[PDB]
Amino acid sequence: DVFHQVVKIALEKDGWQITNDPLTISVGGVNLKLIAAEREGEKIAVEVKSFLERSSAISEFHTALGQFINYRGALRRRQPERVLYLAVPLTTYKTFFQLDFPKEMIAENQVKMLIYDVEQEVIFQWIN
C-alpha cells in the first residue's frame, strides 16, 4: 500500500492525473492494483512493484514480468493507446536491474519502466 501511494504521489508531482486505481480489465474470459493515469491526453498504466514482495528479487521479477506481459496483452485489446509501465524503486533499478540477466530480459520483452525514488517520492527516469 505504501509503495502504491509513493508512485501515485510521484506521478502527481509530474502533473499526471490518476483516473483509476485499480485499473480493472477483463478480456478473453478472464478478469485480470494497476494505476491508470493521464496527462494532456497521453494515457498510461502503471504496474507498481516494491521488490520487497517476496523472497528474492529474482522471484519477484518472475511474477512482475509475467504480470507485465499479460496486462500489456489485455490492454492492447481494450485500451490500445494506454501504455503500460513497470514501476520499480531506484535502489532496485541500480542493483538488480544492472545485473546482466534482468537487463537482458527487460530488453527481450520490451518492458517499459518507471523508475521512482522512494525517499523523496519522485519520478527519476522513464525507460523504453
Query: Contact positions toward a copy of itself, by CB under 8 A?
Result: 27-32, 58, 61-70, 73-74, 99-105, 108-109
Q: 57 with 92: CB under 8 angstroms?
A: yes
Q: Does 117 bind Cl ion (CB under 5 A)?
A: yes
Of the two residues 10 and 45, which places its CB atom closer to Cl ion in the complex?
10
Q: In 3D, which of 17, 50, 16 has the Cα closest to residue 33?
A: 50
The residue type at 79: Q
Part in contact with Cl ion (CB under 5 A); list of ranges 4-12, 65-73, 107-115, 118-126? 118-126
What is the smallest separation between the CB atom of 13 and a copy of itself, expressed in angstroms? 30
Q: Does 90 bind Cl ion (CB under 5 A)?
A: yes
Of the two residues 12 and 73, which places its CB atom closer to a copy of itself in the complex?
73
The residue type at 69: I
* 59, three cell numbers: 522471484
Q: Which does 118 bind (CB under 5 to 8 A by kind): a copy of itself, Cl ion, none?
A: Cl ion
Q: In 3D, which of 93, 85, 71 has the Cα closest to residue 27?
A: 71
Q: 126 with 84: CB under 8 angstroms?
A: no
Binding site for Cl ion (CB under 5 A): 89-91, 117-118
